[PDB]
Amino acid sequence: CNCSRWARDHSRCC
């Protein structure tokens, strides 16, 4: 997932 540091979106799948 887009588990980047600035994960603003709902895709916080980390």
The whole-angstrom separation of Cα 14 and Cα 1 is 7
Q: Taking a C-beta distance cutoff of 8 angstroms, is the pair 11, 1 a contact?
A: yes
Q: What is the DSSP string of 1-14?
A: ----TT--SS----
Q: Taking a C-beta distance cutoff of 8 angstroms, is the pair 1, 13 a contact?
A: yes
Structure-solving method? NMR
Number of CB atoms found within 10 A of residue 3's CB: 9
